Amino acid sequence: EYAVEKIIDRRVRKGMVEYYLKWKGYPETENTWEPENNLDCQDLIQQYEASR
């Protein structure tokens, strides 16, 4: 439902993987943690998982 600009960080909460992302067009204050199942951006994810 909302365009994702980039993945800032990652964590495991409740056995669930979550991504801290920033939405394009919105302020950093709007950044939110979203479980991986909420994302539709394999490019950013695959790219983030490689930057480690």
Binding site: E1, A3, V4, E34, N38, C41, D43
Partner: peptide
């Protein structure tokens, strides 16, 4: 790309 916002 995109993502659901909770």
């Amino acid at each position: 790309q995109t993502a659901r916002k909770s």
